Amino acid sequence: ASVYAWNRKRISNCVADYSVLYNFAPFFAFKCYGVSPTKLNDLCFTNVYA
Amino acid sequence: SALGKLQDVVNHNAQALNTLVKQLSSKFGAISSVLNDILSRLDPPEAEV
Amino acid sequence: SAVQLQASGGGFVQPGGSLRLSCAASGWAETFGHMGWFRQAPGKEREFVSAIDWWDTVHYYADSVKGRFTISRDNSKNTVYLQMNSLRAEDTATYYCAYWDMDYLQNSIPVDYWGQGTQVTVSS
Ligand SMILES: *[C@@H]1O[C@H](CO)[C@@H](O)[C@H](O)[C@H]1NC(C)=O
Numbered sequence: 001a002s003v004y005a006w007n008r009k010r011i012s013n014c015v016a017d018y019s020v021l022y023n024f025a026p027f028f029a030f031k032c033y034g035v036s037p038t039k040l041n042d043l044c045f046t047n048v049y050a
Numbered sequence: 051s052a053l054g055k056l057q058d059v060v061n062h063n064a065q066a067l068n069t070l071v072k073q074l075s076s077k078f079g080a081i082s083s084v085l086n087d088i089l090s091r092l093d094p095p096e097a098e099v
Numbered sequence: 100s101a102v103q104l105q106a107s108g109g110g111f112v113q114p115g116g117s118l119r120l121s122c123a124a125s126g127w128a129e130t131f132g133h134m135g136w137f138r139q140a141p142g143k144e145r146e147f148v149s150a151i152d153w154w155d156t157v158h159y160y161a162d163s164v165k166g167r168f169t170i171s172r173d174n175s176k177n178t179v180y181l182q183m184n185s186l187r188a189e190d191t192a193t194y195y196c197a198y199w200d201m202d203y204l205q206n207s208i209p210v211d212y213w214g215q216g217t218q219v220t221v222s223s
Contacts, residue, residue, distance in 0.1 A: 022127060027177070030100070030127040034081065036093040037100075037129070043090060 009050035017041060102126040104134075104214040105178070106196035113223045114188035120181030121173070122196040122214060132200035134179045135159070135170060137210060141192050147207040148194070151179060159204075186221070193218040 001007045018041050021028075030037050035045075051057075075083050082088055088097050105123035112118060122134055135150035149170040150159040160168060167186045172179040181194075196214030199207070 026125040027102075028127055029129075029131055031130055035091045036096070037127070038093060039091060 007050075011048055011050060100127065100129040100200050100211065102128045102132075102198060102200065102212045104196055104198060104212065106214050106217060108181075109217045109219045112186060112190075112219055112221050114221060115185050116221065117167075117183045117186050118181055118219065119183075120194075120196075120217065121178040122181070123176065123178040124198075128200055128212075130200060130202055132198055132202065132211060133157075133204060134172070134196070134198055136181060136194050137197035137207075137213070138190075138192050138194040143192075145195065145197070145210075149181070150199070150204060150207075153202075188221045191220045191222075 032040070035043060077083050080088065081091065091097075102124065103126040105125060106121065108118065108120040110118070120136075122136075124134060131153040133150050133153055136148040137145040138148050139145040146163070147159070147161060148164055149161065149168050151157070151170045151172055153172075155172060158170070164183075166184070168181070168183045170179060170181055193216035195216045197210045198212030198214065199209075200211035
């Protein structure tokens, strides 16, 4: 969607969380505020948007 | 209030203790009060701060 | 951050020759830092050469490389070049394609990521 028309999603249990996105693109920014990017897998993020 | 003098002593120390535990909740400017959470969210190199 | 760098090029340049290098980038990073080269003169300390902004808004040059160095990023394959004009005869060094993983370079000494050394001698 466009920058003004940015979307929103309410992820809640389906397949797998991460370690897949760690290559989805050859080069991609992974700026994380708070949670450490390397510690993103075994946490439990309750209310998450996309 | 006949036994006021003793009652306040039991109130003062007990409420002072209850403030001390209640002082644990404040984040003191950190991310979260629970330090186990900090050790789990942030990486150790940047969790000391 | 975990960033892999893909540098290639070099050869055997001559007094007054030139180079046209390349340095591709791949890997997740905390921020979009600047690519570039930290060349140590042979036996010397690692020295900043010429840094381009990731958005291609800031260019940098140094006296030891002014007039005979320039950095530019490929818009197609995202391989930042090191293309120059009339490089002198003293640049017989090994050129590391270092990686400042910061959006702005206050000082060049803290170089989060680095690259491979490009050993090019300068003689005919
Ligand atoms: C889309 O991106 C995801 C991110 O992890 C990765 O599986 C892959 O690059 C693509 N696959 C899917 C699920 O479409």
